[PDB]
Design a protein around this ligand. Structure first.
Ligand SMILES: O=C[C@H](O)[C@H](O)[C@H](O)COP(=O)(O)O
Ligand SMILES: O=C[C@H](O)[C@H](O)[C@H](O)COP(=O)(O)O
Ligand SMILES: [Mn+2]
Ligand SMILES: [Mn+2]
Lengths: 215, 215
């Protein structure tokens, strides 16, 4: 995999290019550990999220689009874990699903999802702004980010913080047309086609440690 | 809309053609009331569900694929509503999300979703067969079906019962490439292209009433 990602640059470059894409309002592709999910997620910053970016995720990914939030923001929204005794294989920190209370119809159109996501990520948001259940799936990122938990959830929020953006992002798993999940060759090819930088959680952990970067 | 669906036949024909497609292992497209969601869902029977059918749903629909279950089956799986005080606009009966405990990896590939759905729909299933949370979204159909509640959830289960199939089906909302939801002209066109019959919940209610059909 190492050599596959070489063309995107050394790990530090890979991280710096992803941060700059995010600052520019573009998306990135994040791979977790080969020994974990070995999946690539499209990641976008909520701040600059557009309907066309949401539509791309829905067309090209699993369609189960997740909103990665700080613990603080999730608590502000009064979003408890979806299940108390999470026995999923990674303990993915799904809250109950959400829908904007206002400004949406059925909730599932690209525009409606963006409306819900922006409503939820608003630092001035209140619980009553969101109906439950709905068609956006919030995830609670662990305090400490990828240095505490090597999930895409933490990678997403960490990327936003490292980039100086509002600490909220969306993710969704890149899927091949035939329904199988994209593996690294397909992710790199998709990244070239859509001018999206590629990086790994390992890249982020290396980077954060070496630049004594608490967030 | 009336006249749009004329080419698929009168309401009774529309229902009988959908039932026969399902018996053949093919999918159908179901529209709810114009005054409700005004959306079309791809519906497949769980009995004959294939990975390629799941992949089609993911590519062409919202990707939030739902497993419509009887109340009895949902209780057998120990699936409580995702939220106790559901304040979503239709009261969609989302349970907590599920993942097959065995035979899957990350859960989101077309194959993994089918594995989870078949595990859940198995009449001999037990709660321990499913991790929670996951990437399949079960819905509880109301007793009485579309004669008690005019949702796609009830339409799906009612279609399976009326067709003589195991009373479980999957649904997902047809989405246009640009992210907006398909409306009836696009649904009819998609149905022609994929040789899928189209019908409405109104068609089903008419049909059930006229053929004093309890299920
Ligand atoms: O629906 C979200 C899926 O669980 C993905 O695995 C998502 O990337 C978040 O999972 P994690 O933070 O554990 O990598
Ligand atoms: O995720 C599922 C969506 O809520 C759809 O609306 C689905 O078709 C089920 O909703 P209902 O039974 O209320 O039509
Ligand atoms: Mn992941
Ligand atoms: Mn519906």
């Amino acid at each position: 995999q190492s050599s596959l990602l070489a063309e995107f640059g050394d790990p530090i470059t890979r991280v710096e290019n992803a941060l700059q894409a995010l600052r520019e309002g573009r998306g990135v592709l994040l791979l977790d550990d080969e020994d974990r999910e070995n999946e690539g997620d499209i990641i976008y910053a909520v701040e600059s999220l557009t309907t066309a970016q949401m539509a791309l995720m829905i067309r090209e990914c699993s369609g189960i689009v997740c909103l990665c939030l700080t613990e603080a923001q999730a608590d502000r929204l009064a979003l408890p874990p979806m299940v108390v005794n999470n026995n999923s294989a990674n303990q993915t920190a799904f809250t109950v699903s959400i829908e904007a209370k206002h400004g949406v119809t059925t909730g599932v159109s690209a525009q409606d999802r963006v409306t819900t996501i922006k409503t939820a990520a608003n630092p001035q948001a209140k619980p009553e702004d969101l109906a439950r259940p709905g068609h956006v799936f919030p995830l609670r990122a662990r305090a400490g980010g990828v240095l505490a938990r090597r999930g895409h959830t933490e990678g997403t929020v960490d990327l936003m913080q490292m980039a100086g953006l509002q600490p909220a992002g969306v993710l969704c798993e890149l899927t091949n047309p035939d329904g199988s999940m994209a593996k690294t060759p397909e992710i790199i090819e998709f990244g070239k086609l859509h001018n999206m930088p590629v990086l790994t959680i390992e890249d982020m952990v290396q980077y954060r440690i070496q630049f004594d970067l608490k967030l």
